[PDB]
Amino acid sequence: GWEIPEPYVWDESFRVFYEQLDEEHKKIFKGIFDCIRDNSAPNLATLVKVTTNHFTHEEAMMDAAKYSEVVPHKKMHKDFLEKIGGLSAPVDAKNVDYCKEWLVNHIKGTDFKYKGKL
Ligand SMILES: [Cl-]
Numbered sequence: 587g588w589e590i591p592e593p594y595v596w597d598e599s600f601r602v603f604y605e606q607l608d609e610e611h612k613k614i615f616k617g618i619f620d621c622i623r624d625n626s627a628p629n630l631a632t633l634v635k636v637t638t639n640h641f642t643h644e645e646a647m648m649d650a651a652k653y654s655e656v657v658p659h660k661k662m663h664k665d666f667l668e669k670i671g672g673l674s675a676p677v678d679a680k681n682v683d684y685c686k687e688w689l690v691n692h693i694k695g696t697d698f699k700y701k702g703k704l
C-alpha cells in the first residue's frame with residue numbers, strides 16, 4: 587500500500603484537482619491527526635461528521651458526472667462510515683491504524699480513478 591505520512595498530514599501527492607474535495611480530504615487527515623493526539627469523544631464525532639460530509643459531496647459529484655465507477659465507490663464509503671460510526675473513544679491503536687491506512691489507500695486507490703472525470 588501507499589506510504590502512511592508521519593506526521594499524519596495531507597500532502598500534494600494526494601491531490602485530486604477539485605478544490606472542495608481536496609479541502610475535504612485535508613480535513614479528514616486533520617480529523618484523524620487530532621484523534622491521534624487527543625483521542626476524545628468530540629474528536630471522534632468530528633471525524634465522523636467531516637468524513638460523512640465529504641462522502642456525500644464526492645458522491646454528489648460522481649452522480650452528477652454519471653461517473654460509471656460510482657457504485658463500488660459508494661460501498662467503500664458506506665462500510666467506512668459504518669465502521670467509524672460504530673467506534674467509541676478512546677479509539678484503540680488497531681482501529682487508529684486502520685483509519686490511517688484506509689484514508690491513504692482510499693484516496694490514491696479509489697478516489698484517483700475519478701481524476702478529470704467529475
Ligand atoms: Cl505515492
Ligand SMILES: [Cl-]
Pocket residue numbers: 702703
Ligand atoms: Cl474522459
